């Protein structure tokens, strides 16, 4: 299941209908940018588990045999 989540995060633009605004936004890699931008200011409000999960997923994105 974690591998499925990572694979979705590689290419999440496929889940949207073609030529729609969401899909053009996601096809440019803006999803990961927004995710890391939110994670940057996330640490203040004391969410250690959620930030840890985000970081672990971003790290596991750098694995082979995907």
């Amino acid at each position: 299941e974690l591998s499925v989540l990572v694979d979705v995060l590689h290419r999440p633009e496929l889940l949207f209908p073609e030529n729609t605004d969401a899909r053009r936004k996601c096809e440019s890699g803006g999803f990961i940018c927004k995710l890391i931008k939110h994670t940057k200011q996330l640490l203040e409000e004391n969410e250690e588990k959620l930030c840890i999960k985000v970081l672990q997923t971003l790290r596991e994105m750098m694995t082979k045999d995907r």
């Binding site: 949207f16 209908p17 729609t20 605004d21 969401a22």
Partner: protein, 140 residues
């Protein structure tokens, strides 16, 4: 504020742990765990019409092509979903009813998806944030 937030109604936890082992818990079919409300029904029947009104209004909003385009209807939608959230968290809904409401809300958001500088209404975001608590409760 007059009726929903009043005694004896009070918050209920959706996950229980001190489950007495000697009790029945039989095969209990599939969707009948949320039952045996011999005392909750006496409060339930008077808000039954309110709950079905909420459900039919949300279905009507589903039928509308653009749910978040009218500014004056946004107030009614926001307070309706707030009332639904308060009703749910107080323990006024069943499992199948919660699934129907979840399907309705997901249909609203999917229609919004089909619709898809640009200063959006803050209360539209408030409405969108409201249903997240409902989703968390139904997951629990």
């Amino acid at each position: 504020h007059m009726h929903v937030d009043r005694d004896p109604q009070e918050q209920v936890t959706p996950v229980k742990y001190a489950r007495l082992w000697s009790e029945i818990p039989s095969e209990i079919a599939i969707d009948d765990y949320d039952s045996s409300g011999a005392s909750k029904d006496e409060i339930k029947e008077r808000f039954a019409q309110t709950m079905e009104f909420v459900e039919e209004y949300l279905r009507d909003v589903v039928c509308q092509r653009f749910p978040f385009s009218d500014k004056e209807k946004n107030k009614l939608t926001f307070e309706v979903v707030n009332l639904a959230r308060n009703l749910i968290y107080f323990g006024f809904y069943n499992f199948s009813d919660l699934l129907r409401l979840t399907k309705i809300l997901l249909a609203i958001l999917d229609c919004v998806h089909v619709t898809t500088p640009e200063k959006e209404d803050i209360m539209v975001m408030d409405t969108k944030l409201k249903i997240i608590e409902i989703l968390q409760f139904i997951l629990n």
